[PDB]
């Protein structure tokens, strides 16, 4: 809880409306790094392979992730 | 996202947890800027000075917001 | 007794550009200030001012 | 006829630290690949390799606390 930290991440906007394994093609998890002090979760929906950034801090998201 | 863009924002982690307007001492809304290309919404919970970053794209949040 | 201890002593009405604001604060009604308050930090000079919650330039603006 | 298309040819059972992982691309069990595939891209050389979905170095690495 300081000021603005300059960061470099893939995800800028984080999609909210959840889903389930059924619709998700691939799930890409990216561990926290020096450039992006947070985990990034990018799902590719079989629906036109629409890529969506999810919130790793979200309960549902956590549930879906770990199996 | 065509790639990674260098960005400078107040919010790094978005508490996509729940809430509503009991408590919430204050709610800050920072329009999208050249430095952060998406609006930030910082809530200062009535209790304990604790600050939470809310997802501006969250239906609940857009509705909690469009309620002033 | 009619009493009030709010942050705003002055309420702006002069319409303001969506892009001229740097920050916006919404402090909801309380016993100490039964009225909602919206304080904007303008980009220019970073001057803080209060906008009318009831105003359209605001209701429209509130589609942030 | 018939056909089967999994991405993995080798399954790295050897341990691995979250430290050296760039990312995981977890692919859900499909009709074409009747199991889940977890491809890791090591930080080192950006090397890709498959890890066993049912291995501990993975389950504990499956971070969420």
Author numbering:
A (entry chain B): 1 to 67
B (entry chain A): 1 to 68
C (entry chain D): 4 to 67
D (entry chain C): 4 to 68
From the paper:
Here, we present the crystal structure of mouse IP-10 at 2.5 Å resolution, which shows a novel oligomeric association. In each molecule, the N-terminal extended loop is stabilized by two disulfide bonds between conserved cysteines (9:36 and 11:53). In each of the two dimers, the β1 strands from each monomer associate to form a six-stranded β-sheet with two antiparallel α-helices lying on one face of the β-sheet. The dimers (A–D and B–C) are primarily stabilized by reciprocal interactions between opposing β1 strands. The main-chain hydrogen bonding at the interface is limited to reciprocal interactions between residues Leu27 and Ile29 (thus accounting for four hydrogen bonds) owing to the presence of Pro31, which disrupts the β-structure. In addition to the A–D and B–C dimers, another dimer is formed between molecules A and B in the mouse IP-10 structure. Intermolecular contacts in the tetramer are through molecules A and B. The two molecules associate through their N-terminal loops in an antiparallel fashion such that their α-helices lie on one face of the β-strands, while the interacting N-terminal loops are on the back of the strands. The rotation axis parallel to the β-sheets and dissecting the A–B dimer relates chains A and B with a rotation angle of 179.1°, as calculated by LSQMAN. This is a novel association in which the tetramer consists of two six-stranded antiparallel β-sheets, with an antiparallel sheet formed by the N-­terminal regions between the two six-stranded β-­sheets and all four helices lying on one face of the β-sheet.
Interferon-γ-inducible protein (IP-10; CXCL10; 10 kDa) belongs to the CXC family of chemokines and is secreted by a variety of cell types. The biological activities of IP-10 are exerted by interactions with the G-protein-coupled receptor CXCR3 expressed on Th1 lymphocytes. IP-10 acts as an immunoinflammatory mediator in Th1-type inflammatory diseases, rheumatoid arthritis, cardiac allograft rejection, multiple sclerosis, atherosclerosis, sarcoidosis and prostate cancer. Oligomerization has been demonstrated to be an essential requirement for the biological function of IP-10.
